[PDB]
Amino acid sequence: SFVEMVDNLRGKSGQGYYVEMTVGSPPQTLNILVDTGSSNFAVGAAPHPFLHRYYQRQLSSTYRDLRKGVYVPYTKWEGELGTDLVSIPHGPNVTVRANIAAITESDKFFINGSNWEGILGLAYAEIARPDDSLEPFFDSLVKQTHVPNLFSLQLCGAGFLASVGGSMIIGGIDHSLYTGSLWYTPIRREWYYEVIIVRVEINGQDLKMDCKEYNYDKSIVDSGTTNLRLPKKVFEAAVKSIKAASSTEKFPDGFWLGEQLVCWQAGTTPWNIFPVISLYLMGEVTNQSFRITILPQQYLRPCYKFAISQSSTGTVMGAVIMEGFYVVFDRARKRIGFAVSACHVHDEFRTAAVEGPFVTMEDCGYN
Numbered sequence: 102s103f104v105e106m107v108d109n110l111r112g113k114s115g116q117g118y119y120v121e122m123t124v125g126s127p128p129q130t131l132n133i134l135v136d137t138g139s140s141n142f143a144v145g146a147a148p149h150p151f152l153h154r155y156y157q158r159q160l161s162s163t164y165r166d167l168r169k170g171v172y173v174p175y176t177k178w179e180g181e182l183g184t185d186l187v188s189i190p191h192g193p194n195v196t197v198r199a200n201i202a203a204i205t206e207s208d209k210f211f212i213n214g215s216n217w218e219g220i221l222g223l224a225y226a227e228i229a230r231p232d233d234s235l236e237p238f239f240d241s242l243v244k245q246t247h248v249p250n251l252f253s254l255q256l257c258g259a260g261f262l263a264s265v266g267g268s269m270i271i272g273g274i275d276h277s278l279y280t281g282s283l284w285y286t287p288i289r290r291e292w293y294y295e296v297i298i299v300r301v302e303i304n305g306q307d308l309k310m311d312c313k314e315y316n317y318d319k320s321i322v323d324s325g326t327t328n329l330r331l332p333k334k335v336f337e338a339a340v341k342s343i344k345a346a347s348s349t350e351k352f353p354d355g356f357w358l359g360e361q362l363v364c365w366q367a368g369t370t371p372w373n374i375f376p377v378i379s380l381y382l383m384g385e386v387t388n389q390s391f392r393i394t395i396l397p398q399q400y401l402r403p404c405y406k407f408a409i410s411q412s413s414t415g416t417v418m419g420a421v422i423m424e425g426f427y428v429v430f431d432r433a434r435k436r437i438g439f440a441v442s443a444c445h446v447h448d449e450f451r452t453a454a455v456e457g458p459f460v461t462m463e464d465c466g467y468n
């Protein structure tokens with residue numbers, strides 16, 4: 102019953118959504134970031150100033166050492182590979198033996214005060230560390246249980262660091278979580294959750310770009326990223342258009358750079374000054390697409406910060422984008438569904454939307 106998975110997610114604004122999990126025998130309780138942007142089940146397994154709890158392998162009778170290290174530098178974290186029994190108390194009623202990367206040392210990986218101690222990489226083996234032979238959690242879950250190869254995310258944010266809530270429905274779609282129709286965009290390739298954006302408008306105004314630019318060098322849906330992140334050329338075009346629309350009110354550049362914050366007081370925020378943003382995603386039929394339309398309430402995150410920023414690794418549809426909608430990761434049919442969320446924030450003049458069809462290319466993909 103999905104009803105027991107409702108509101109199984111919590112977090113702090115800007116610091117991700119986490120679900121409660123247990124690992125080991127007896128069960129060790131840990132909060133684990135839901136991350137569709139990576140593919141490793143990786144959990145703090147040694148003391149760290151930002152961790153108040155951590156996985157203690159020696160306390161687990163069901164821990165098995167894989168005798169294999171793993172080192173992941175970026176911008177880092179290193180750990181030791183093992184397997185153990187994992188459950189999600191407010192998830193499916195099963196227990197699976199899953200790969201676990203036990204993080205023993207890290208640098209700028211954990212977040213102070215996030216309240217989570219590990220990461221649940223929900224993307225595909227191709228991008229797993231150290232390599233694609235380390236079966237991701239969800240793969241193990243499906244193989245080991247009768248849980249359908251699908252999960253869905255309703256991220257709700259805060260609404261009026263702020264506390265956020267949401268739901269991760271594993272193995273199905275909870276119709277109470279959304280209104281209207283679900284529209285599906287193909288998963289272009291099973292590594293990240295890669296999709297194709299075929300067009301984008303700001304307040305109805307088409308950015309008029311070669312659609313390859315929207316997916317340069319790729320477009321992904323990533324719960325583990327807070328912001329809508331856009332390729333350099335698309336970002337600049339987006340900000341320009343947004344600056345203009347909100348002209349009647351000038352802000353510091355630091356704000357547009359996602360650095361400085363902008364403040365009003367108690368429901369005086371002039372939301373109407375900021376334009377909506379429509380992302381058209383490739384449909385299940387070639388020259389057919391649909392749009393998801395987001396409000397300023399989504400891309401101005403709480404005083405507010407500009408939750409749109411520049412990317413050098415392609416477009417990233419992160420939390421603030423997912424927060425408007427109910428997002429279905431239909432792995433079984435290689436597609437991602439979008440519908441209007443039951444919990445999305447909106448005012449009395451505009452509302453987040455998912456609408457289709459809109460006729461438009463397979464040539465929007467950037468190899």
Ligand SMILES: COc1ccc([C@]2([C@]34C[C@H]5C[C@H](C[C@H](C5)C3)C4)N=C(N)N(C)C2=O)cc1C
Pocket residue numbers: 117134136137138139140141143173174175210211220222230323324325326
């Ligand atoms: C296996 O290694 C990784 C796993 C996850 C991530 C992150 C990360 C990295 C930090 C910061 C934030 C939250 C959590 C810790 C996961 C994103 N998750 C996403 N989606 N992104 C874009 C990341 O940078 C990064 C790495 C290197």
